[PDB]
Design an enzyme around this catalytic site. Sequence first.
Site, PDB file in Angstrom:
ATOM      1  N   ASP A  35       0.814  -1.198   0.000  1.00 30.74           N
ATOM      2  CA  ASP A  35       0.000   0.000   0.000  1.00 30.74           C
ATOM      3  C   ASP A  35       0.860   1.265   0.000  1.00 30.74           C
ATOM      4  O   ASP A  35       1.370   1.666   1.050  1.00 30.74           O
ATOM      5  CB  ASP A  35      -0.901  -0.025   1.238  1.00 30.74           C
ATOM      6  CG  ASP A  35      -1.798   1.195   1.348  1.00 30.74           C
ATOM      7  OD1 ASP A  35      -1.930   1.935   0.355  1.00 30.74           O
ATOM      8  OD2 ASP A  35      -2.413   1.369   2.428  1.00 30.74           O
ATOM      9  N   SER A 199      -0.654  15.703 -11.944  1.00 31.66           N
ATOM     10  CA  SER A 199      -0.910  15.362 -13.333  1.00 31.66           C
ATOM     11  C   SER A 199      -1.150  16.640 -14.137  1.00 31.66           C
ATOM     12  O   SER A 199      -1.658  17.636 -13.616  1.00 31.66           O
ATOM     13  CB  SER A 199      -2.106  14.402 -13.428  1.00 31.66           C
ATOM     14  OG  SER A 199      -2.521  14.186 -14.762  1.00 31.66           O
TER      15      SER A 199
END
Length: 330
Positions: A35, A199
């Site tokens: 994770d 992004s």
Amino acid sequence: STGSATTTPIDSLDDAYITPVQIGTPAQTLNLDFDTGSSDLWVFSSETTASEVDGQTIYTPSKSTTAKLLSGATWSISYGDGSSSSGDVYTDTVSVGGLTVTGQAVESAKKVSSSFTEDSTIDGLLGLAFSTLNTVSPTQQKTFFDNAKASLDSPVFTADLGYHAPGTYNFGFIDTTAYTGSITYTAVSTKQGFWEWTSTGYAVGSGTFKSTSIDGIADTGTTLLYLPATVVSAYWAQVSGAKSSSSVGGYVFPCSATLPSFTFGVGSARIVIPGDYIDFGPISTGSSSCFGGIQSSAGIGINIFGDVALKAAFVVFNGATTPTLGFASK
């Protein structure tokens, strides 16, 4: 040193991925959920409340000659899905795919929430976010990657998740045969303890690319792609019959649909998520309403590039002095 381990979807939807991890001496092999959005290595154990164990493999520290109680240390964690666990701590030898760390903090669960009990395939979590998020008290502990880092050939690990198929976690090296083209690297903020990046924009299907900054985290421990409501609405507007269902808890679409792809930007590069990756199947067995793999982050407080996004790429988690993230197509 290096390590390399195969990671395998837990079910036919890729709800999560499990990777075998060796703990203790002799080895006890548990299947952990790696994770990159948390920083605790915790396991079902011989200490876990019996009523809360249902098919998982447990770690039994009393059977390990290298286990040592970390006296006084406790841990307690809550995840973004509302699940939680807590317990005490041992140090022991932990190996992943041939890479061994001695003295690793292994957090033994005394209690787990129902979601964990009900998932027989996940024996615990192995956190790969920054050690500043580790919950051990009163002495915070280091992640497996943090402990291994100085010994690694290069201070990196890579995630190469498969779509409806196994993939690979590598530690200490970049497998240049595992991706196409070049890797585009992008800056990381560690201020919140995550692999947080920005992004450069998105496209829906064959549509034009929208240049827009989207801050979010690269999180292997989250199933879906969670993005701003504007972006998510633009995507689902291209699917006939798709709608946000308050009762179901997100966007659903007719199972008869063909889903468009979704592209996200990494610098000047582009990662394309095929439409099929965005299908999470019937909302309930036999339903003709299917659950979408792109959902709104509104009310989470952060955007999350979870498995839906990450499995479309070869992803480098670069833990150099100034960390960065790399993405390549594959």
